[PDB]
Amino acid sequence: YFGGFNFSQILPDPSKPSKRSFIEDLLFNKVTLADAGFIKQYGDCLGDI
Amino acid sequence: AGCLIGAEYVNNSYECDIPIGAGICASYQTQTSQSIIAYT
Ligand SMILES: *[C@@H]1O[C@H](CO)[C@@H](O[C@@H]2O[C@H](CO)[C@@H](O)[C@H](O)[C@H]2NC(C)=O)[C@H](O)[C@H]1NC(C)=O
C-alpha cells in the first residue's frame, strides 16, 4: 500500500521463475532475438535439419 | 559459455575477479592449499 499507487505491473512477481515484472515480459516478448550466446554448443548443427 | 577444466565450483559468492561469462567468475583464493575456484 504505497499511498494508493498500485506499482503491481513494474514490481516483480514470485510466480515467474525469471522474476521479471509484467511490463518486462512484454518488453522481452516484443524483441525477437537471435545469437543470445552459446546455444548451438558444437552439437546442434550435427543434427542436420 | 562452455565447460571449465582445472577450477572447481564453490557455492559461495564473491565479487567478480576474472570474468568468464554467464554470471560465472573465477578467482585464486585459499582452500585450507591454494587453487583456482569458480563461483557465481
Ligand atoms: C493493480 O494492478 C493489478 C494487476 O497486477 C490489478 O489486478 C487486476 O484486476 C483486474 C480487475 O478488473 C483483473 O481483471 C485482473 O485479473 C487483475 N490482475 C491480476 C490480479 O494480476 C489491480 O486491480 C490493480 N489495482 C489495485 C488497487 O490493486
Swiss-Prot record, chain A:
The region called Disordered is annotated at 33-49
Annotated region described as Fusion peptide 1, given as residue ranges: 21-42
Site positions per UniProt: Cleavage: 20-21
Residues listed as glycosylation sites in the UniProt record: 6
Protein's job = Precursor of the fusion protein processed in the biosynthesis of the S protein and the formation of virus particle. Mediates fusion of the virion and cellular membranes by functioning as a class I viral fusion protein. Contains two viral fusion peptides that are unmasked after cleavage. The S2/S2' cleavage occurs during virus entry at the cell membrane by host TMPRSS2 or during endocytosis by host CSTL.
Q: What protein am I looking at? A: Spike protein S2
Q: Which residues of the full protein are shown?
A: 796 to 844 of 1273
